């Protein structure tokens, strides 16, 4: 989001369906996407919202576009929608410890009763 | 708000049951080894 | 967008619970056979 700043890379919007989209303001029809200096591919005209996957997959990294003349400035994207999250409350830790101790005690009784 | 708590509890239960399944598999391996020892 | 993956997580959690019940039954039967031997 920079005018004259040679950025030319803006995120379309948030998911609204479960997936993020990019947008390059290059006046050319085809655009050459770049991630850390590696070519990813051109883009057709039926869609100018080249995606990175689903927002649940945590898309992150440097993204830029080469439209007509020169490579634009990168755009560090950072996404973490608490996909694999466990709540570290007292109840969670207490239940985890309780289940672990109970399972260990039951297995110990099992391996002790099989002597002979 | 309820969806966040549901996802959190589901992930915690998933991980806890994975750990319990690993412990049960270890116990089953020890038991079957002790059983096949006598055969 | 939200209730799409939570449902799959609940399904796989129920699957893991049923799998754990079956594994508990298998271990109980094996230990009972070992004690009767």
């Amino acid at each position: 989001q920079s005018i004259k700043g040679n950025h030319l890379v803006k995120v379309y919007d948030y998911q609204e369906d479960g997936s993020v989209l990019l947008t390059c303001d290059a006046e050319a029809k085809n655009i050459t996407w770049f991630k850390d200096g590696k070519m990813i591919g051109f883009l057709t005209e039926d869609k100018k919202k080249w995606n990175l996957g689903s927002n649940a997959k945590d898309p992150r990294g440097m993204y830029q576009c080469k439209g007509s003349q020169n490579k634009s400035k990168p755009l560090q994207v950072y996404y973490r929608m608490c996909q694999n999250c466990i709540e570290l409350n007292a109840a969670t830790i207490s239940g985890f410890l309780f289940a672990e101790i109970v399972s260990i005690f039951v297995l110990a009784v099992g391996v002790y009763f099989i002597a002979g | 708000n309820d969806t966040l708590l549901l996802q959190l509890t589901n992930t915690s239960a998933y991980y806890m049951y994975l750990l319990l399944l690993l412990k049960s598999v270890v116990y089953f391996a020890i038991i079957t080894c002790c059983l096949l020892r006598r055969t | 967008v939200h209730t799409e993956k939570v449902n799959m997580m609940s399904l796989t959690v129920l699957g893991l619970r049923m799998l754990f019940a079956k594994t508990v039954a298998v271990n109980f039967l094996l230990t009972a056979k070992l004690f009767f031997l």
Binding site: G95, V102, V106 | - | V24, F28
Partner: peptide, 27 residues
């Protein structure tokens, strides 16, 4: 919901203990 897990855990313990007692009484 941790209520489901608490209930199934106490049910697992109860079932294991009762099956052990039943195998003891039968044998």
């Amino acid at each position: 919901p941790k209520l489901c897990y608490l209930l199934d855990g106490i049910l697992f313990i109860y079932g294991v203990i009762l099956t052990a007692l039943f195998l003891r009484v039968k044998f």
